[PDB]
From Swiss-Prot:
It comes from the Bacteria. This is DNA gyrase subunit B. Heterotetramer, composed of two GyrA and two GyrB chains. In the heterotetramer, GyrA contains the active site tyrosine that forms a transient covalent intermediate with the DNA, while GyrB binds cofactors and catalyzes ATP hydrolysis. It comes from Escherichia coli (strain K12). DNA gyrase negatively supercoils closed circular double-stranded DNA in an ATP-dependent manner to maintain chromosomes in an underwound state. This makes better substrates for topoisomerase 4 (ParC and ParE) which is the main enzyme that unlinks newly replicated chromosomes in E.coli. Gyrase catalyzes the interconversion of other topological isomers of double-stranded DNA rings, including catenanes. Relaxes negatively supercoiled DNA in an ATP-independent manner.
DNA sequence: TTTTTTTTTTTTTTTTTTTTTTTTTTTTTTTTTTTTTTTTTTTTTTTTTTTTTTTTTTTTTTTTTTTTTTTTTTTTTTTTTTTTTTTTTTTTTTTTTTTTTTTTTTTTTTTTTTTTTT
C-alpha cells in the first residue's frame, strides 16, 4: 500500500516494514549519513512501477520523496519511472 | 428519647509472587587463503632404426648348511557367556490437498484536543 511520508514522519519512525525492506534491498545501510554508502547499491536501475491510477501517482510521489530526502541515488540517475497503461 | 451491639471497607503499608529489562556461551556466516583444471609454446624431452664390444648363462663337477627329522610342552586357539554397538519394524507427529467456520493489521489527508518536555 502507501508508505510513510518521510517529510512529515520523524527519523525514528523510519523503522517500518516497508521502508526497512526497501533499504535492505537497496543495501544503502538504511541510515542517512552514519554509514550511507551509495557505491554498494545492488541495482543501478530502480524502477517505480506503481499502478496506472491516481493512488498510484500518490504512492509514486511518496517514493520520490523517500528517494530524494533519504539523494545521490537520484542525482546519479539510477531512479526510473515506468508508465503502464490505464486503458485497453 | 437516649443509649448499646455488630458489620464491613477503608486509613491502608508490608510480604509474596509475577512480570519485564538484561547480557555468557556454542552455533552461524562473510572474508582471505590455499587446492584444482585448461590453454601456449617452448626448449626440451623422448620414441624409433642401424652398429658395436660386452658380461652373464649354460657344457661339467664339488661340497655343506640349510633341508631332513621326532618329540615336549608350551599358548594361541576355540568355546561359552555377556555387554556395546549397529541396524531395521513400529509408532508418532506434521504437512499438503479443497470447500467451510472465524478473524487481524500498516499507511495518506486536515483539524482539534490531550500529554509530555523546555
Amino acid at each position: 500500500g502507501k508508505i510513510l511520508n518521510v517529510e512529515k514522519a520523524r527519523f525514528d519512525k523510519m523503522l517500518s516494514s516497508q521502508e526497512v525492506a526497501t533499504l535492505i534491498t537497496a543495501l544503502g545501510c538504511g541510515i542517512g549519513r552514519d554509514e550511507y554508502n551509495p557505491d554498494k547499491l545492488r541495482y543501478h536501475s530502480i524502477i517505480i512501477m506503481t499502478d496506472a491510477d491516481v493512488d498510484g501517482s500518490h504512492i509514486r510521489t511518496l517514493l520520490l520523496t523517500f528517494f530524494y530526502r533519504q539523494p545521490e541515488i537520484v542525482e546519479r540517475g539510477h531512479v526510473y519511472i515506468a508508465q503502464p497503461p490505464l486503458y485497453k
